[PDB]
Amino acid sequence: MLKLLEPFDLNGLELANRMVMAPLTRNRAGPRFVPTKMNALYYAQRSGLGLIITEATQISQQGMGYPDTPGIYTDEQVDGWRMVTEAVHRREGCIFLQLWHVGRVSHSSFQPNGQLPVAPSAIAPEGEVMTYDGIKPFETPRALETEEVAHIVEDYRKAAINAKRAGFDGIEIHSANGYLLHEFLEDGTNKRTDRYGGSIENRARIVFEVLDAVCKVYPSRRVGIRLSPDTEFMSMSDSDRPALYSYLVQELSRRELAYLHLIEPRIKGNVDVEKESSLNVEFFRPLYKGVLITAGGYQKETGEERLQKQHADLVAYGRWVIANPDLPSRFEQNAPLNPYDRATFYGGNEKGYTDYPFLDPRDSQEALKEAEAAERKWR
Ligand SMILES: Cc1cc2nc3c(=O)[nH]c(=O)nc-3n(C[C@H](O)[C@H](O)[C@H](O)COP(=O)(O)O)c2cc1C
Questions:
Q1: Sign of torsion, CA 146 149 154 157?
Q2: Which of 164, 173, 180, 366 gets the highest tally of CB atoms within 10 A of its CB?
Q3: CA 22 / ligand 1 centre spacing (Å)
Q4: Which whole-number Å values give the CA distances from 37 to 106, 159, 164, in the listed order?
Q5: Containing domain of residue 379, as a range?
Q6: How far is the CA of 193 from the centre of ligand 1 (A)?
């Protein structure tokens, strides 16, 4: 009798329930940023979530900023993702690839030919960044030329082509948490004077140019987008977030997208934060007429409330799904939740990744069987 467990129709995609695996960077790609059988197992284990949004996946080496995240810009990478989508689909799951460009949240040691990370404007984020040779201060990034934006937009279009060939049901545009697109959206990071800076509609321009390009590949009802309307993560700031996101969301609503994915302000990227704000999903339900996914800090009870009060249509869980591959079944049965271990969120191997237990061992067996079958299919 939990609305969390009610099947949901996503414009032809028959989701098993109203719960979503939030996108989660795990830094466990194989060589050349290629997904592995072990990654296929991880997603196959979590196929019981109604919808699985993959970890952020860079559209280019220029768009990477952390070790061993997977890409979607080479055929080798596509072939690795094929194991993932095959195993998820053999378990009757649904999976969207999250397309990524870290913008200024990178280091030249990740970049082709030691180039600086690129950004709307040359403003470094505060603090330090993990590199192949340890922690380092951020560099001032290079501000993109006007004629380079169309080239980054085209990288998204090519990424969407590769996502479709890899067998993803859809794609999610990462426009949150301080990365390239979010940097363009906020006037604290966007100081451009050309047609991508200045007015609210110029700073949003790159998001709409990305959406136009990827909707030449997928139908718009298979394209989602993720926003963080009020976060300080990675040095973000903007002088009028209400007017920024109300506009952006109202314009997103007329685009007939798969969904809008909003992060609650009580999350600062990957951690909980003490924070008062009125730019939460309650505020954006009015302005968006499509499918609305709410994310960040939810438990069973608080997620159920959002659905019951119709403040959202779907609820995304991140850290709990890291630790509970069968989170819907645990909610349904009022079962204890495995605690999540932050120490193994990032990097490493099966430990803290595929070795969290199920309520039903046949669930683990079936995920292993499909991961192994998927590897044999796409050897
Ligand atoms: C370890 C970790 C990795 C994450 N990676 C991503 C990511 O790749 N893309 C993204 O949009 N959000 C990412 N997030 C943010 C989550 O999607 C989610 O918004 C956040 O964990 C809060 O939701 P929760 O309380 O259900 O965990 C990550 C969060 C964590 C903790």
A1: negative
A2: 180
A3: 6
A4: 27, 21, 20
A5: 1-379
A6: 33
